[PDB]
């Protein structure tokens, strides 16, 4: 199926409590593979997946150089944004950046991204065409004009369509045993009497990878959403994911209800009943 590489960067000012803190993380699909924390012991980009340990010293030096340079860029950005929004030097503020690329089942380029947020909301984003910018508000147009002048979009396009896709393929190969695996969910249903009048049916999916899954309830083979609860897909901590979906039913009617499970690791969807 499809794959992605993404980098996520967060900088937070803390005036009168030192200089800003900067954290960077890198993912392939749902698997983190690198981190950097400006306040941490190593002062280097660090591995977080086994397959990245195959990279040599020049890689670790270059990734460290680039991430430290980016941390300095965000420090400057924080001061500028304060000016743009006519804010005081006293409050804490947050800059975030994300970029990366998606590829299809054939591992060819599908889409690229490069976008920014200030204080929890959109600031500026490279459009899907990888040639123009969308400014979220009036203040952001000033950045748009500077970045247009610099012709940075051309450089970003070259990376997103080229290096990004090639290194994603590299990692997928080097970490094949884990990244290209499909762990189908282990499934089960529980029953609990909430009262004499109603019971809860809970349909579980455990130990699966990748994160993408669909859990749905039907009554008499018709889709049911009313009186259901579906939790956010969550990490188990071991590289796999968990999810459940529950429905509250009248006592004596449990047999009408079926849970349906769709996942990449399942050739055909699963049906569960009480």
């Amino acid at each position: 199926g499809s794959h992605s590489m993404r980098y996520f960067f967060t900088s937070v000012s803390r005036p009168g409590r030192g200089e800003p803190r900067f954290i960077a993380v890198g993912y392939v699909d749902d698997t983190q593979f690198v981190r950097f924390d400006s306040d941490a012991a190593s002062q280097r980009m660090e591995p977080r997946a086994p397959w990245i340990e195959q990279e040599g010293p020049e890689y670790w030096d270059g990734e460290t150089r680039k991430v430290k340079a980016h941390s300095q860029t965000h420090r400057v950005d924080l001061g500028t944004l304060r000016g743009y929004y006519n804010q005081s030097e006293a409050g804490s503020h947050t800059v975030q950046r994300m970029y990366g690329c998606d590829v299809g089942s054939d591992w060819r380029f599908l889409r690229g991204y490069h976008q920014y947020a200030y204080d929890g909301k959109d600031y500026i984003a490279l459009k899907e065409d990888l040639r123009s910018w969308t400014a979220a508000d009036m203040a952001a147009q000033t950045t748009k004009h500077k970045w247009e002048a610099a012709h940075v979009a051309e450089q970003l396009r070259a990376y997103l369509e080229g290096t990004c896709v090639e290194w994603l393929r590299r990692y997928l190969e080097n970490g094949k045993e884990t990244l290209q695996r499909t762990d189908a969910p282990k499934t089960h249903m529980t029953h609990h009497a909430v009262s004499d009048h109603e019971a809860t049916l809970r349909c579980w999916a455990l130990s699966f990878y990748p994160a993408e899954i669909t859990l749905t309830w039907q009554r008499d083979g018709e889709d049911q959403t009313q009186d259901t609860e579906l939790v956010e897909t969550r990490p188990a901590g071991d590289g796999t994911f968990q999810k459940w979906a529950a429905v509250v039913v009248p006592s004596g009617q449990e047999q009408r209800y079926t849970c349906h499970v769709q996942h990449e690791g399942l050739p055909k969807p699963l049906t569960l009943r009480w």
Binding site: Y7, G26, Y59, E63, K66, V67, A69, H70, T73, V76, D77, T80, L81, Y99, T143, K146, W147, A150, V152, Q155, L156, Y159, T163, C164, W167
Partner: peptide, 10 residues
């Protein structure tokens, strides 16, 4: 692998 691009000031 990260982009080898220094972005301009905002």
């Amino acid at each position: 692998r990260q982009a080898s691009i220094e972005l301009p000031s905002m």
